[PDB]
Design a protein around this nucleic acid. Sequence first.
DNA 1: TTGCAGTGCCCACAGAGGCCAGCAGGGGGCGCTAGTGAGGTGGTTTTTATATGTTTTGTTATGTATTGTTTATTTTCCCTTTAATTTTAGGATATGAAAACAAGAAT
Length: 88
Amino acid sequence: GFLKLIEIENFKSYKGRQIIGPFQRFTAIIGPNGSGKSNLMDAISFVLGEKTSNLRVKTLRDLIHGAPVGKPAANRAFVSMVYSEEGA
DNA sequence: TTGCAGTGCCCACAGAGGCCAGCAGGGGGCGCTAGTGAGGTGGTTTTTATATGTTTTGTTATGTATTGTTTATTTTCCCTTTAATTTTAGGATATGAAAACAAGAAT
Ligand SMILES: Nc1ncnc2c1ncn2[C@@H]1O[C@H](COP(=O)(O)OP(=O)(O)O)[C@@H](O)[C@H]1O
């Protein structure tokens, strides 16, 4: 089928658990500069798995919320997707 | 002797014509002068002409500037040869990141 929606925890300006909306056949993510939007794609690649450098980040302990400043949100992060396919 | 018919003489006063002064006619020759007219001489200027001085024009010589000339040092186009310099593996490093182990903590 396709990807229904994405769930993030303590990752790239995403405090706590927030349910991102369900994804239709063609949606879009729009916002001004520095709004924290490419990080959604970074999480998509992350749950798919890829080396840290292409996520404009090193050592993979900087990916937690608040880590680039220097004060992490916690030592604990979830990311989770739900794939929706036909046959219910 | 006389009357009558006819003659002689003396005068005189118009009568007449030469004499004469007066006076007017024509044209000959001289005394004198006003007023031009022309001709000759002298003065003046003047005008042409001639000679001298100054300046203007023409010719000659020297210096400067322009054009040309064979050098002559660029200069620049064209070779063959290096001296950096770049590119391609090939090995080694490093720093990360899972992975396993060991250490609290809970059940
Ligand atoms: N964990 C984080 N917490 C807070 N701010 C962050 C965090 N990671 C990145 N940022 C900052 O958020 C800003 C938004 O950029 P980013 O999140 O990368 O996405 P986008 O490029 O779509 O704006 C950047 O200045 C980035 O440095």
